[PDB]
Nucleic acid binder design. Structure first.
Lengths: 110, 8, 98, 81, 98, 98, 98, 81
DNA sequence: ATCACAGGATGTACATATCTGACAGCTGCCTGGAGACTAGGGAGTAATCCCCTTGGCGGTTAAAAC
DNA sequence: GTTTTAACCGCCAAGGGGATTACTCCCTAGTCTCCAGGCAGCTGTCAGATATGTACATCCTGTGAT
């Protein structure tokens, strides 16, 4: 009898689908062959980035007295983190708005 | 021997 | 009558990660779509960089090293090093199990 | 046949967009320039979207076509697939 | 004597209000009509999905807001608080669109 | 007496095209390298655009119409239409021959 | 008694001369030393091909020339003929680099 | 170990680069800012090139590595392969 | 006689009560991922060569510094 | 305009390693079978949108004053 099925995500201690990433790499016309550890590494990287953005968005939501993350929270999280802003510099988030930035020259004179 | 219509 | 054709998304994985990082915080449909598009975009970026790396070195296989170099080339500063550490940890654990 | 719809982008709309951009005072000639710039940008994006739609042999411009057109121009949009 | 705010208090209030808000600032029907009129020149009898028009409006508003931020920066560089078409032209020339 | 490895380049074809467009005109090594890099870059651009066009439409074959759509997307206007005309003429001649 | 040109004739002459010319404007050895010093922080005992350093110099000079063009445009926008560091900062901010 | 090599980009070199860019009058503070900008640009390009070289298991930074590094930053350079 | 408060008007942030629709959870199932093998070639590794990078050294003077 | 210096060039020399070739093995594509993770579909319910009234925050002009 064959052994009980165990997902590759559980082996690496990851929540993202390692098998789905492997299938997308194989069927994405990227290379003739795909290594075994490559989908694991890519799933780990994607999970880390998602965790960072979700943590920052949850912090923003808690600061806005909300319990559900909305696009505004994601936009605030992305544009407030320097590295995340650099990564998504040319990315537009729908319904995210803009930061409250008013130039100091336009402020009233005391 | 070769001319392009883009430059007329 | 007939169920719509299934469309694969990263919704459940993003929700699991959110519950890991914020047990009490939820997520809206638009925010979930934005997260899914972000995951797809990052996956496409990393895969394309790894493919270009393999082509430049006349290699036929994308391995952990090629993805790692793609991550180092695409993520800025602390993001790159943290992603490298997380990925190497995951690969080490995966090879340690089976 | 639709005509003269660029005037539909009214002066208050451009003023609101400038306020969101942080502009405190707007000249009267700003509106025509903004309308022209918006027309050029929409022309480019719609041209790319229609090219994508025609390649797919479809008659309906889809959200995915717009997303692909924006990505081709380095203006990736999140939240529409 | 009726109450009147000085010329610039209401402008700052509007700036704060529209930077706090996230809803679209252009009317939906005029923008849809403009999109359809522009698309008429590329292919006749074109249909549009609602999500397509919404995405187009989102992208256009984001682009216009970024352009207005650059225009405001250029106008401040010229020791002015009023944006002028020359500021927009300079911003678009530096960006590389002209 | 170790012969250097074979490095493929578009030099001979660029030279033939130059002799077609300018019989009494030469080209330097640096200019030839620049033209070869231009050909390679345009090839990569069009091939990538065709590949993503095929992926978007869930097709596994890059055909003439995918390349045509890539040319229409990547080239600026009159260049695009003249390139499309030349490509269609070449494909028609090739199909007519055998 | 000695012949002296007015303050700006020689500047225009140099502009014309260096826009006619195409040779590199930075000395080779100082730029190579700077490249090696910068690369020392990334990897030790690194070696460089001559073509690599030439390509780096060409790219750096092209980038600096484009930046100076944008800076001149910014300075003209402020009703000035002298470029200032704030002009460079504005150009880089509009470009999307700082 | 090399040090203080940013000063090798002399004032006349920056002046020549500005003249090629059409600049007629140059402030005295332009040179430090230009050196800093050039240092940042070179740091980015060299970091990408060294990453490419390390991935290739090479110890010599090649022209192809620099070309790939520039192309990744949207600065494709012809004439070097 | 030009400058701090007084106070009025406007707007905005802040509890509070309704309600709703969108989000989170449960269910059935099917298709895609997992287990278990085989074949074959892509790549890791060892040996070698020569070339091309690095180091040095002296003379000239154009260019850098003042 | 005057003084200084190191960039450049020509030449020589050593060797590090990039590139090539040979060999071999083990990692992945491919296939078959099996099963359970995830997706479409419902559904209930509570977080936030919407009034709604209220307590400040802030702006602006009059005005008393040292």
């Amino acid at each position: 009898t064959r052994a009980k099925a165990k997902t590759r995500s559980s082996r690496a201690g990851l929540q993202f689908p390692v098998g789905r990433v492997h299938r997308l790499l194989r069927k994405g016309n990227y290379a003739e062959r795909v290594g075994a550890g490559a989908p694991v590494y890519l799933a780990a990287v994607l999970e880390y980035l998602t965790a960072e953005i979700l943590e920052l968005a949850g912090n923003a939501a808690r600061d806005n007295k909300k319990t559900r993350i909305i696009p505004r929270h994601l936009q605030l999280a992305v544009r407030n983190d320097e590295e995340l802003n650099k990564l998504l510099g040319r990315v537009t988030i729908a319904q995210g708005g803009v930061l409250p930035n008013i130039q100091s020259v336009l402020l009233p004179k005391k | 021997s070769r001319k392009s219509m883009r430059q007329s | 009558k007939r169920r719509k054709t299934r469309k694969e998304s990263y919704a459940i994985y993003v929700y699991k990660v959110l519950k890991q990082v914020h047990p009490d915080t939820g997520i809206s449909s638009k925010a979930m779509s934005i997260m899914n598009s972000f995951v797809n975009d990052v996956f496409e970026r990393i895969a394309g960089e790894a493919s270009r790396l393999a082509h430049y070195n006349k290699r036929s296989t994308i391995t952990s090293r090629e993805i790692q170099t793609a991550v180092r080339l695409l993520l800025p500063g602390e993001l790159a090093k943290h992603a490298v550490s997380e990925g190497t940890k995951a690969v080490t654990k995966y090879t340690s199990a089976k | 046949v639709l005509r003269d719809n660029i005037q539909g982008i009214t002066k208050p709309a451009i003023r609101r967009l400038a306020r969101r951009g942080g502009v405190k005072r707007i000249s009267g000639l700003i509106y025509e320039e903004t309308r022209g710039v918006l027309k050029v940008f929409l022309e480019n994006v719609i041209r790319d979207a229609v090219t994508y739609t025609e390649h797919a042999k479809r008659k309906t411009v889809t959200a995915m076509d717009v997303v692909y057109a924006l990505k081709r121009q380095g203006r990736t949009l999140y939240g529409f697939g | 004597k009726p109450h009147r705010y000085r010329p610039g208090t209401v402008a700052l209030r509007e700036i704060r209000r529209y930077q706090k808000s996230t809803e679209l600032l252009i009317r939906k029907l005029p923008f849809q009509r403009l999109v359809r009129e522009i698309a008429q020149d590329f292919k006749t009898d074109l249909r549009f999905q609602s999500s397509a028009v919404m995405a187009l409006q989102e992208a256009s508003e984001a682009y216009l807001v970024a352009l207005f931020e650059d225009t405001n920066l250029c106008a401040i560089h010229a020791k002015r608080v009023t944006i002028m078409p020359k500021d927009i032209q300079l911003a678009r020339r530096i960006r590389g669109e002209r």
